[PDB]
Amino acid sequence: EVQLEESGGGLVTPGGSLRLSCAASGYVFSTYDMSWVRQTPEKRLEWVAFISSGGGRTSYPDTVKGRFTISRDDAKNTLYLQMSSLQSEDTAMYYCTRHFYAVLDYWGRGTTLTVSSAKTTPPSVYPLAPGSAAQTNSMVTLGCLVKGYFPEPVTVTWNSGSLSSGVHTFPAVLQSDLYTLSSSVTVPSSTWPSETVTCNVAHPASSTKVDKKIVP
Amino acid sequence: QAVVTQESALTTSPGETVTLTCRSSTGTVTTSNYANWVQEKPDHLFTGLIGATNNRAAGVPVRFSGSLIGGKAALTITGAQTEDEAIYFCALWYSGHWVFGGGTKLTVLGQPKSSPSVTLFPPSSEELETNKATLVCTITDFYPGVVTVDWKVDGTPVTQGMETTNPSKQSNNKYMASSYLTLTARAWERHSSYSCQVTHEGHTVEKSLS
Numbered sequence: 031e032v033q034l035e036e037s038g039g040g041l042v043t044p045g046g047s048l049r050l051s052c053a054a055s056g057y058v059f060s061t062y063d064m065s066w067v068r069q070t071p072e073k074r075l076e077w078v079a080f081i082s083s084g085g086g087r088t089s090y091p092d093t094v095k096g097r098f099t100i101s102r103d104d105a106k107n108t109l110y111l112q113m114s115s116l117q118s119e120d121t122a123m124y125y126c127t128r129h130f131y132a133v134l135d136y137w138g139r140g141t142t143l144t145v146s147s148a149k150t151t152p153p154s155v156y157p158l159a160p161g162s163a164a165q166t167n168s169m170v171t172l173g174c175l176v177k178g179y180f181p182e183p184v185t186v187t188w189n190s191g192s193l194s195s196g197v198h199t200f201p202a203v204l205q206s207d208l209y210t211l212s213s214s215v216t217v218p219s220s221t222w223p224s225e226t227v228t229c230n231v232a233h234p235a236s237s238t239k240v241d242k243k244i245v246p
Numbered sequence: 247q248a249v250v251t252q253e254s255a256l257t258t259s260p261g262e263t264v265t266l267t268c269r270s271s272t273g274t275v276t277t278s279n280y281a282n283w284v285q286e287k288p289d290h291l292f293t294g295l296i297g298a299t300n301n302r303a304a305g306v307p308v309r310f311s312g313s314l315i316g317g318k319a320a321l322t323i324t325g326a327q328t329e330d331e332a333i334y335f336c337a338l339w340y341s342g343h344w345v346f347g348g349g350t351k352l353t354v355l356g357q358p359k360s361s362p363s364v365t366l367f368p369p370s371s372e373e374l375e376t377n378k379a380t381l382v383c384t385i386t387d388f389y390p391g392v393v394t395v396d397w398k399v400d401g402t403p404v405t406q407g408m409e410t411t412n413p414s415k416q417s418n419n420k421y422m423a424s425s426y427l428t429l430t431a432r433a434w435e436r437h438s439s440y441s442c443q444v445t446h447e448g449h450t451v452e453k454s455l456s
């Protein structure tokens with residue numbers, strides 16, 4: 031059972047250095063050529079480095095030439111990516127893959143790298159109330175705008191976990207070096223505003239928690 | 247170096263045959279480009295399907311095939327199945343360098359088409375106090391997973407200050423997305439009408455606020 035496992039990513043600041051590891055198992059690691067590839071936040075895949083069986087050839091795209099260095103340790107079944115001069119466009123999930131006779135068949139699970147100078151920052155939480163008695167239906171949708179935090183993630187719950195059907199929490203966007211995301215819930219018209227609906231936002235990197243009550 | 251381009255999105259139905267293509271800007275794809283096709287499924291799970299133009303990997307269903315067609319590499323799925331809805335990337339080998347395409351979002355109709363449910367929210371009093379105003383347009387329950395969102399302020403199309411998330415898959419396999427219009431609280435007080443328009447499968451759902 032072929033397995034590739036990357037690790038070593040986390041948060042660094044521009045100008046920093048870091049070594050990612052890709053540990054292989056379940057096949058004879060020394061026979062194959064390998065590559066590292068990253069998937070960016072815009073969701074594109076970019077090839078980043080290549081090393082052949084034996085280590086005699088390595089090759090890189092011009093954007094990381096001179097900064098990244100791939101190498102391999104056959105005795106430990108592990109592929110490395112030495113990164114220096116990191117820049118914020120290096121923020122991505124990094125994956126190792128093997129060249130199985132020119133077929134990129136097995137890919138690892140990937141490790142996240144965020145390169146940013148932002149400081150740890152708790153979010154501000156604002157309520158999203160219909161802002162109209164034009165209530166489409168007998169269902170009313172409400173929300174929480176979770177703005178300006180760093181880094182990810184945040185977890186959103188409603189009424190402390192008691193309200194869980196009809197919740198959509200969207201992927202976060204990057205607005206000016208900080209993240210923003212929204213979560214919404216749709217409830218029956220007779221629930222609100224008779225009953226209370228609060229969004230509970232937890233931000234683990236800053237150990238902060240915010241509870242926002244949504245009022246008409 | 248080369249620019250690699252693939253169809254952005256395709257829609258097929260289960261049991262049919264779809265073909266996805268990959269072209270180089272360099273001119274013509276060849277056997278010595280060892281075209282590869284990698285599948286991406288939800289939760290960033292990558293699987294190599296085809297490499298060396300037409301060599302299928304082990305365990306990959308037989309309905310996937312690779313070939314070169316009119317100067318391009320191609321992937322055909324004969325008998326597309328429901329679990330095939332996913333993103334497909336191609337990579338071309340340039341004497342030591344891999345160059346990947348943008349990836350095609352392939353939909354395999356596994357449920358009736360479903361129109362987006364759109365909700366447009368006004369900025370709150372508490373964010374106004376900070377001299378900023380965020381308009382949030384939430385779009386859910388749509389299938390297929392591709393939408394287009396346009397904003398208008400007083401009937402004029404907005405060209406900056408907006409950010410839309412990429413469609414993400416819901417529990418029920420329909421998709422959702424968010425869009426944001428970021429203004430200053432002065433700007434919010436100077437305009438009367440705000441509109442969020444969502445275009446899905448030829449139909450436009452619009453939500454406006456005054």
Ligand SMILES: CO[C@H]1O[C@H](C)[C@@H](NC(=O)[C@H](O)CCO)[C@H](O)[C@@H]1OC
Pocket residue numbers: 061062063064083129130131132133280339
């Ligand atoms: C000729 O170079 C290409 O085609 C070659 C066949 C590849 N060699 C290997 O894949 C393997 O690692 C061979 C096992 O030693 C190499 O990675 C590359 O793949 C696109």
